[PDB]
């Protein structure tokens, strides 16, 4: 059987993570499991130097395991997993999962959850799709999956692009593999890293102040990112304050608060007049990721952009 | 036929049937540009605004809702040409300040009226129907867009680009419409229009409240910004279940026990932030927001204001309407 | 606290807590199973049939349907435990002809109870819930699954494997449940229980009523089939807005002037099958099934033809329940 | 500008076939279309001999064009699609789309679909993705692509797996491709067939009679596909007939009623002792499509099993 690694960065979600085995019993019939708790936080606090930590953990004991599971808060799972899409450089499958319902709580999802993770990992097949999530049966994409409702256990979809496979009994079918580039086909390196570039994110609404936009300026923020109205149009003294800005030099990415659908180039915004990159399908904190990374490489716009329509 | 209004907010959501006879409009050319609307309805179209609906705000919203007040007997139903950017959020808006009684239906239009296969033609024909139907009374303030009446409490747009952005997300539709006729099968239950107690025909100016959003490493500064500005109430987009970044929730624990109102809602697009979870909002001064999502959330927030500064009595405004 | 019912259909939905204590039960185990049942009701079982509903008939409907109405004044409310293949044509039946107002609740599991993660246990809880809430009363039958209450006319199972298939595809939920609390915001138009006029407690057998399929170069044989068998009824499952392949066409309109009740329903899975769209129904007698799909167009059709076989009033019927 | 054919079936979708470059004169910024009628019928009247008309069609004349769209009734556009799907062998895009409402009504959406699959059919990244079903600004795949709603324009969605990409401002981002096997990597060669084998479908629900199986038994019908409730389960006496069928040689597929999800194997019905077939994602009207192709080939049902685990 495949020797599978879990790293834990929170509570379990089963049933510390050295007994992970003897809760869920049916992963000794799939694989050799051995846990590390890297961190132990609440995913509504995770931050920089924990995906730091991640990425260079995987990429450094790469080589002494056949594929990775991370159990991970369902808050902020869907940006992790994109930070790890865009930084492991290791050839083996990276599945990250967590719970919605408490694992002390009636009908805990957690153990089935974890159960179809350990799968994924284990399964050849899993490999060189990128950083992948795997909930509710179904194995997501690290790039386009998105946390849906509140508390639902179905909550995790990759709403744009659709899933890559569904578990049964035990088994993957894959139709699908995220054509984007991810993994060893992006030039973003952490491993000598300490820290990531400086990049917040502003909302629009009816009658929205500048005064967020403007609090990030004025802290030197390396970017921007406008979760816009519609398809990314900006509050008109928001959009003022962002084009002073990029004019400066700050990045300034349009994305939307419209949960589906992307912020497209060639719309209601001159992005090449004012200095903007549009985010296409990437949701504010997914463009916060990779408006990060980007700024690891360069900060000119017409190269940003190009980023964000290759990863 | 029933006099129907058409206040418009902005440009044209339909052109054509402007070809002039004299050898030598604006709204008023929508009975041109969709001539069947004779067929359901004595139209008058007026002007109120005409701006970009990304750039809506509290003096629009308080012109709109004044003047559906004032002009109610006046009319038998209105029709609301808008933007679809911001479109729920005057909708939400209006449905809890208009007291008229008879129908007050938005409708927009996701492509231009100059491009191929323009929705805003059968659009704003579907959206008369519905101002123009005797069911349609006592629903609150509707949406009306591709062949479905939406409630104004729960409708949002869920794709950047799609005709069929508009849904209820949450609850669902009221009807849909087919063949100029409707089916309805729901009506909202949580209190509107005239069983609200908000009252906006004498204020120029509406509380006020900013909206934060959370992710990994979120910055304190944009909360901190609000709270020096002195802003009334403040709107958190939590993660999940309406959570906080640490920093976030620092800031916001500070402005709830220095005179702000802090309410929680979520950045996830369906599903409700609840009382009973993970951040005791008793201990905090926390109100949650139910599945109003973040500038739905703020609306009432806004409202809730101009009643009442107690947190319980928020939470409690946030529960019936 | 509440008196509540549980009417077993099949095996059970939720195991253990069954250890013996005697050196030396079925439905009466689920308060072992799921002990956090006495903090919210009395619960009594008991299993009327055992079954897997992929054979569910018309003899087990008229058993619920009678004992319900029986039972009625025993009892403060039910819960039945039934397999999910077939529960959206159960709870249906169940809402045309269920004459008590006190709440019915079905609910299942997409797991096995005996699996990882089981649904079953929280289901069941979530189920007696609803049935106790005095706010579900007067809504119709009920469908509990996955934290959500579903009116019984339009939930429907949405995929074959997920905990989360059964939604209410047209109009959305009643309400959803959190910590053991309801926010209902809707309730279903449509005329339910003792509203209607379908009256079964004396009926020992229901009329005959059939589908058929269409599909491109569908053959007519299985609509042959059904008129040669004298079956009162036949549900077409159309394609698109209810229409038929040439050859099923042909069959159904003889059949429906040589008394045969026809109905137009769809196998798309959402929206309605409308009249005054591409088939004639006037001229060919036909009926339209608007939002019920063909299984659930089949049970008002039956229901239906306990009262008349006039074409017209059968329409009417499919307009009002 | 590319050479485009649009080959019609039906009634124009837009403003006959000849003058649609008058009805959508944006066409001729983008191609040189040319039409030709092959049906004019209703697409509720589709049948086998249209569908073998127009495989052979577009594989003779592959070479003359630079790519083939298809205008077709939205009714059974699914079957079509995924019939073209495994039996074009040609190396060009092939796009089917039609309108939800009358080309005549207001806000026809007929006009701009037909524009966008224009663009599809002459981008050269369409290539190799299958056939493609174009509607409401998406490019979808012909084996997952289904109706979803009785009248919406947004009607048609991949429901599994999800769209291939969407089209903004002229111009697709392809974000994914099908990885079922489809066009030339099939065996179905359909050039020389006049007819195709005999498969009906029945459906099952509470009470279901047997009638139907029984009546396409004794028609001596070649497959029946089983419209399933929940995963792939059967009514008794539906499950009786054509458990005896299959003992005498009809092949008999489980598909379901149900519309996503798969109808698995390794569920409540033991397939191999019953010579039955489990269909996947496909629904019953897809499943018979790949059911009369297979029995072109082969009547094991083993080996159907494996053609439906494959295409």
């Known amino acids: 059987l495949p020797n599978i690694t879990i790293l834990a960065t929170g509570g379990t979600i089963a049933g510390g993570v050295e007994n992970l085995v003897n809760a869920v019993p049916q992963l000794k019939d799939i694989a050799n499991v051995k ?68 694992s002390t709580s009636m009908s805990a999802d957690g153990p089935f959850n974890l159960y179809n993770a350990v799968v994924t990992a284990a399964d050849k097949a899993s490999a060189n799709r990128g950083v992948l999530v795997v909930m509710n049966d179904t194995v997501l994409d690290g790039r386009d999956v998105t946390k849906t409702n509140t508390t639902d256990v ?38 000598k890293l300490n820290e990531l570039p400086k990049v917040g994110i502003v909302y629009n609404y009816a009658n929205a102040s500048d005064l967020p936009a403007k609090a990030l300026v004025d802290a ?10 519609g398809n990314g149009n900006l509050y008109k003294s928001v959009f003022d304050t962002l084009a002073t800005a990029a004019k400066t030099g700050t990045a300034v990415v ?49 190269q940003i952009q190009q980023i964000f329509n290759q990863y």
């Open 35 to 102: 846990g590390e708790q890297v961190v132990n936080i609440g995913s509504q606090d995770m931050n920089d130097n924990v995906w730091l930590t991640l990425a260079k953990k995987i990429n450094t004991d790469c080589d002494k395991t056949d594929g990775f599971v991370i159990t991970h808060g369902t808050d902020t799972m869907e940006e992790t997993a994109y930070f790890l899409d865009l930084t492991v450089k290791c050839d083996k499958p990276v599945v990250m999962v967590g719970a919605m319902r408490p």
């Open 154 to 191: 179905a909550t995790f979809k990759s709403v744009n692009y659709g899933p890559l496979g569904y578990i049964h009994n035990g088994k993957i079918d894959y139709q699908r593999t995220p054509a984007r580039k991810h993994t060893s086909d992006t030039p973003f390196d952490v491993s």
């Open 220 to 229: 030197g923020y390396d970017g921007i990112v406008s979760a816009g109205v």
């Open 254 to 302: 349009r994305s939307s608060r419209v949960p589906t659908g992307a912020t497209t180039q060639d719309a209601e915004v001159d992005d090449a007049k004012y200095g903007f990159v549009a985010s296409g399908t990437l949701n504010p904190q997914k463009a916060r990721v990779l408006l990060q990374l980007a700024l690891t490489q360069t900060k000119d716009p017409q």
